[PDB]
């Protein structure tokens, strides 16, 4: 047996973890044991792979040298679901939550009240997407423990979260695979062995996120929107079809150029009204993550813009400073995909807009309509606003691309 939180009881947490790791060693498939042996030798790279694997092409994912290892570890973790919640502990960089500065330097002991409040202001009323494998701790780190940052996450993992305790040489660790968003409910300044740490109370918030699994995403999309066409009036159905058949160009350029004001077109305004009522007809039924490969123009840039070169670190820094924690508005209807995978149509696009669509938002899986050029498409309403929570970067071949963690906000 175990409590939900081992708290500072390291001895009881380590005994339970060791007993659990030895027990689970008997549940593992040879391929899982094999992937675990690779993890012990290459944890850093396998964990980083597990974060961004799903932004590559399907064939790049399949052929990746770490893909087999990823899938086996994911499998092993999923087969050891907790029957009740578990509070876990891990150190985190403040940069993870778009606090792109030090809370305090490693050799400093104090965290100023100023810094503490600023960090609170940065993380409050935001959800942040957490992805990838992570070695966590079952107890609050004390004196004898490694404390690599000033930020200690105290995360409540809900019931049915996969957890994989495993022995490594003479040590024992617990692996999770992150695939949810977190909310930082409260922060407190604590003292551990003569130094200040921020202990962040974090909750898990779920979102249906298919990542690279486009076929499952398509099954969900078709399940929820196969009958959507039939719920539309003759006018709504005609304007949705005209939009999808290429009418998006005239509609969206009219919206982008602020035509409703500058050169009013009531015929175009009516189609917009119709497609909007169409999108409101069967609202997105669950919190859903979608992906949009964005062009530079959506972020006030061009292909030749020096600022669009994210291979230069100062350009990511300038992009984050401008957009992180800000709201992004689209006057046009926004096409997105339930899949995160790269696609040839948007092969060169450097910005991946990763949107959390809250349950009940306008939206429709247009790809439920047969014979459409759109790839696993979810259309979002014109004029939508997106709060940017965090921006990350990753290497796609030799090109640095951005992952924009955004939430559709009303």
Automatic annotation (TrEMBL):
<protein>
    <submittedName>
        <fullName>CdtA</fullName>
    </submittedName>
</protein>
<keyword id="KW-0175">Coiled coil</keyword>
<feature type="domain" description="ADP ribosyltransferase">
    <location>
        <begin position="13"/>
        <end position="205"/>
    </location>
</feature>
<dbReference type="InterPro" id="IPR016013">
    <property type="entry name" value="Binary_toxinA_clost-typ"/>
</dbReference>
<dbReference type="InterPro" id="IPR003540">
    <property type="entry name" value="ADP-ribosyltransferase"/>
</dbReference>
<dbReference type="Pfam" id="PF03496">
    <property type="entry name" value="ADPrib_exo_Tox"/>
</dbReference>
<feature type="domain" description="ADP ribosyltransferase">
    <location>
        <begin position="218"/>
        <end position="408"/>
    </location>
</feature>
<feature type="coiled-coil region">
    <location>
        <begin position="7"/>
        <end position="41"/>
    </location>
</feature>
<dbReference type="GO" id="GO:0005576">
    <property type="term" value="C:extracellular region"/>
</dbReference>
């Amino acid at each position: 047996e175990r409590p939900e939180d081992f708290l500072k009881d390291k001895e009881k947490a380590k005994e339970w973890e060791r007993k659990e790791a030895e027990r689970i060693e008997q549940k593992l498939e040879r391929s899982e044991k094999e992937a675990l042996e690779s993890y012990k030798k290459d944890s850093v790279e396998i964990s980083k792979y597990s974060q961004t694997r799903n932004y590559f092409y399907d064939y790049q994912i399949e052929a990746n040298s770490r893909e087999k290892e990823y899938k086996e570890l994911r499998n092993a973790i999923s087969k050891n679901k907790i029957d009740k919640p578990m509070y876990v502990y891990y150190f985190e960089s403040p940069e993870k939550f778009a606090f792109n500065k030090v809370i305090r330097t490693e050799n400093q002991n104090e965290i100023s009240l100023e810094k503490f409040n600023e960090f609170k202001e940065t993380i409050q009323n935001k959800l942040f997407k957490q992805d990838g494998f992570k070695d966590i701790s079952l107890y609050e780190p004390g004196k004898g423990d490694e404390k690599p940052t000033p930020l200690l996450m105290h995360l409540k993992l809900p019931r049915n979260t996969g957890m994989l305790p495993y022995t490594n040489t003479n040590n024992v660790s617990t692996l999770i695979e992150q695939g949810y968003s977190i909310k930082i409910d409260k922060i407190v300044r604590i003292v551990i062995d003569g130094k200040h740490y921020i202990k962040a109370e974090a909750s898990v918030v779920s979102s249906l996120d298919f990542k690279d699994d486009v076929s499952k995403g398509d099954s969900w999309g078709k399940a929820n929107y196969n009958d959507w066409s039939n719920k539309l009036t003759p006018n709504e159905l005609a304007d949705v079809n005209d939009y999808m058949r290429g009418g998006y160009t005239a509609i969206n350029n009219y919206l982008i150029s602020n035509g409703p004001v500058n050169n009013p077109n009531p015929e175009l305004d009516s189609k917009i009204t119709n497609i909007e009522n169409a999108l409101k007809r069967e609202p997105i039924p669950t919190n859903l993550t979608v992906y949009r490969r964005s062009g530079p123009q959506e972020f006030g840039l061009t292909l030749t813009s020096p600022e669009y070169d994210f291979n230069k670190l100062e350009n990511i820094d300038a992009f984050k400073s401008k957009w992180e924690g800000q709201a992004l508005s689209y006057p046009n209807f926004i096409s997105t995909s339930i899949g995160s995978v790269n696609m040839s149509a948007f092969a060169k696009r450097k910005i991946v807009l990763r949107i959390t669509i809250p349950k009940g938002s306008p939206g429709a899986y247009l790809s439920a309509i047969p014979g459409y050029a759109g790839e696993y498409e979810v259309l979002l309403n014109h004029g939508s606003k997106f709060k940017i929570n965090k921006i990350d970067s990753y290497k796609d071949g030799t090109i640095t691309k951005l992952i924009v963690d955004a939430t559709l906000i009303p």
